[PDB]
RNA sequence: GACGGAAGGGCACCACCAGGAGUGGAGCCUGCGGCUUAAUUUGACUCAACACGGGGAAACUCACCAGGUCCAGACACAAUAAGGAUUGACAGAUUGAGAGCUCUUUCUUGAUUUUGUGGGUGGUGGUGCAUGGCCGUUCUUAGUUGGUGGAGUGAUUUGUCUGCUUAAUUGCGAUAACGAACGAGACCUUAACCUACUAAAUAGUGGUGCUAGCAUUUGCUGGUUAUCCACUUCUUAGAGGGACUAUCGGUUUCAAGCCGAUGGAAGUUUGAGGCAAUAACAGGUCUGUGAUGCCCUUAGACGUUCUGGGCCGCACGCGCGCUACACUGACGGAGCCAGCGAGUCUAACCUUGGCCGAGAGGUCUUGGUAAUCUUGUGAAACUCCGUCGUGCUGGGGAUAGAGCAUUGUAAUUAUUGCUCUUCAACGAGGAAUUCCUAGUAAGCGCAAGUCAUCAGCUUGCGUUGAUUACGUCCCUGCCCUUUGUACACAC
């Protein structure tokens, strides 16, 4: 009863979102974080990412 | 499950980060000072440190099994 | 089971290097007291996971960049062990936060 | 957007006391959802046989 | 949209048999895990409960952690018409 | 306190001197303004806007435009209803459409709802001049504060300084100050060394239990680690060791220091970063946030979804860039050497090898969840041997045409790759202006980020590797002292 309400999302910006805030922009999909670069900065420490050099 | 160690440790950190923000959103009154994860074989134990144990353990075994089932239901854990 | 070798390989990996060193020293320690033939703890190059991100949430300001480092240290030991001796030392007293893999090779 | 749905009784059945035995023609079919359906101009609407349905009435 | 009665029933008994319900915050998924219905109907129906009560809702990264409050245990007991005070459903059941 | 077209003293290749590479001129890329548009979505405009929002946008992204659906309008109240609230609908009209959106039409699940009142919810709506957090800048400079004591009615001042020194409010000293605290430093990460310990079939070496091929009386090379033995020099990573300007000489008030020579892996704070005080800015961000105050909107929606377009539009101006103007070169062949990475069973990620194809690429397979395999990423600049021969030329590749492929549901406004073909400006760049002191500048590529595909961009890495100076306050900026002030929203 609902077919026209959908369009393909197999790739690109709309195929993914931040796992914290669903921000389509600024994502870090490196290493499978799937966190945007801005939520990652607040939460880099508890994951295990630390600044040394 | 044959997942690379770099991606697995990253997912372990995201797992810890998920537990960290989850616990402080409900156990805010308990004086949530953090949490620890110990992955023993077939039994990963979540060591919740809270300054008010009388309510995180709840009464008669409540308020902790619900959180125990919530983490099980999300993370697809037996 | 009657004193038959298994040719086990124990591989240790975690970010917290310091307590992994203790267990790597622990695993090698319980071998000579049981007269166990072994190949020593082989240390593998550290994989420095790196993320290069802007400090700013917006676009304004000087273009300053941070590098985050999630270091991971992997080690492995080859032990010529009995079936009994390995099980009651590796299924018990497992250190926190360190991942361990027990695999079998029969070349 | 919706029709009145006037105070109708059962349809496609002639009468129960039509001098004087019960009269309900068009013997039972394989569709109970038996029952008839929406018939407008020499056409049929699927009501139960969702996958395969072969008849032209 | 409109939640069918068996969907409403299967959502309520699932929440009764262990207390908590988790639902991903993504509409138009139509394949909920561990419950055979659309994910939208799970969130919408639980929102209908939570406004009246019976459920304490927390979000925690778009994941919708739901928990059955003690006031709401007796309501779903009335909805499902289970025998009264024979099982808490299921917080204190086995270890005792 | 601020400012001064006031004086004096310091510091800094975001200042200068001596220079190097340039940019500004050219052609294309990209962003901004303007213009135009249905829309060409917005924020930011000296450093502190302008390859910036990780902003390399075909759909999504999306916030803009032209339109079509849905309510994901919770909950309460009153109506409506079980003489049926409403929903789904085949066909055709209508629609871009194979949206029952609406219409000709009437069957089906059945207080799951509809109408209205409230009241919630959503909003990349507005306000960053209501905010949090983060970031940028003053300032990566060296500065800030108090206890007790001294001065002053007081606001305040001294300490916190004339001098010398340092990268440093770093210290030596002076001394109505004395003893302190933060900052700086110390600290941490990383690079450089370790023939010393621990060891290693995921690293390497040598003999050989097993040996083999070529050429000759042993050099190069290919396999087995119950089809072997031994080891850690090179690689790795743990514990550590090591540098503290060590020794000597000179200079300094013979003090902190500085300079030279020797030795050493390292004598520029040993190189480079991480963190970084007080007080602030009406700096930026509400367009990251399920962070949020207030206001606006909320069913013909500023919610969300779908179709297509736009952000890329082109009389023009400006900034960051890429390729060049050639011989220190273009092209052909040959020689051929790195390092930092990443990578799939939660199914197509890295892709080897075989075949086909000019090429792009297609295909059959193998390995790797990774010091194992891609990958010795056999990278480019470079080196040699040749063709060219100062000719806008075989420099240069802009524009434009035809075709062959890949990615994507979709390539038109050409995603990109390849083949042939046109061979435009440009003959070293005006006024002006950027960065930089040793493995540094510059050249040269490679990896990763974004990513289905596309880098001319960024973050790092390695290859080749200069000139010049070890200084000064001339300009610019900052700080301090003295001074003047009718300034304090602070010239
Ligand atoms: Mg300048
Ligand atoms: Mg100059
Ligand atoms: Mg130029
Ligand atoms: Mg130019
Ligand atoms: Mg594009
Ligand atoms: Mg769009
Ligand atoms: Mg501000
Ligand atoms: Mg003072
Ligand atoms: Mg000091
Ligand atoms: Mg644009
Ligand atoms: Mg190599
Ligand atoms: Mg040419
Ligand atoms: Mg020509
Ligand atoms: Mg970019
Ligand atoms: Mg005067």
PDB file of C-alpha atoms in Angstrom, chain D residues 9-44:
ATOM      1  CA  UNK D   9     -29.466  -5.450   3.505  1.00  0.00           C
ATOM      2  CA  UNK D  10     -27.921  -8.547   1.929  1.00  0.00           C
ATOM      3  CA  UNK D  11     -27.767  -8.350  -1.866  1.00  0.00           C
ATOM      4  CA  UNK D  12     -27.694 -10.634  -4.927  1.00  0.00           C
ATOM      5  CA  UNK D  13     -30.257 -12.867  -3.163  1.00  0.00           C
ATOM      6  CA  UNK D  14     -33.838 -12.864  -4.404  1.00  0.00           C
ATOM      7  CA  UNK D  15     -36.079 -13.560  -1.381  1.00  0.00           C
ATOM      8  CA  UNK D  16     -36.439 -16.047   1.473  1.00  0.00           C
ATOM      9  CA  UNK D  17     -40.241 -16.518   1.205  1.00  0.00           C
ATOM     10  CA  UNK D  18     -40.863 -16.078  -2.532  1.00  0.00           C
ATOM     11  CA  UNK D  19     -43.815 -18.495  -2.804  1.00  0.00           C
ATOM     12  CA  UNK D  20     -42.665 -20.204  -0.624  1.00  0.00           C
ATOM     13  CA  UNK D  21     -39.275 -21.909  -0.530  1.00  0.00           C
ATOM     14  CA  UNK D  22     -35.963 -20.115   0.034  1.00  0.00           C
ATOM     15  CA  UNK D  23     -34.573 -18.630  -3.193  1.00  0.00           C
ATOM     16  CA  UNK D  24     -30.857 -17.753  -3.336  1.00  0.00           C
ATOM     17  CA  UNK D  25     -29.447 -18.418  -6.815  1.00  0.00           C
ATOM     18  CA  UNK D  26     -25.798 -18.358  -8.012  1.00  0.00           C
ATOM     19  CA  UNK D  27     -24.515 -21.426  -6.148  1.00  0.00           C
ATOM     20  CA  UNK D  28     -21.522 -21.203  -3.763  1.00  0.00           C
ATOM     21  CA  UNK D  29     -18.112 -20.218  -5.140  1.00  0.00           C
ATOM     22  CA  UNK D  30     -14.586 -20.770  -3.818  1.00  0.00           C
ATOM     23  CA  UNK D  31     -14.282 -17.183  -2.519  1.00  0.00           C
ATOM     24  CA  UNK D  32     -15.692 -16.686   1.009  1.00  0.00           C
ATOM     25  CA  UNK D  33     -14.160 -13.226   1.512  1.00  0.00           C
ATOM     26  CA  UNK D  34     -19.529 -18.113  -0.507  1.00  0.00           C
ATOM     27  CA  UNK D  35     -19.885 -14.395  -1.211  1.00  0.00           C
ATOM     28  CA  UNK D  36     -19.884 -11.961  -4.125  1.00  0.00           C
ATOM     29  CA  UNK D  37     -17.608  -9.008  -4.823  1.00  0.00           C
ATOM     30  CA  UNK D  38     -17.363  -5.614  -6.538  1.00  0.00           C
ATOM     31  CA  UNK D  39     -18.823  -6.086 -10.030  1.00  0.00           C
ATOM     32  CA  UNK D  40     -19.274  -3.003 -12.186  1.00  0.00           C
ATOM     33  CA  UNK D  41     -19.109  -3.717 -15.954  1.00  0.00           C
ATOM     34  CA  UNK D  42     -18.315  -7.352 -16.873  1.00  0.00           C
ATOM     35  CA  UNK D  43     -15.346  -7.449 -14.512  1.00  0.00           C
ATOM     36  CA  UNK D  44     -14.157  -9.002 -11.257  1.00  0.00           C
TER      37      UNK D  44
END
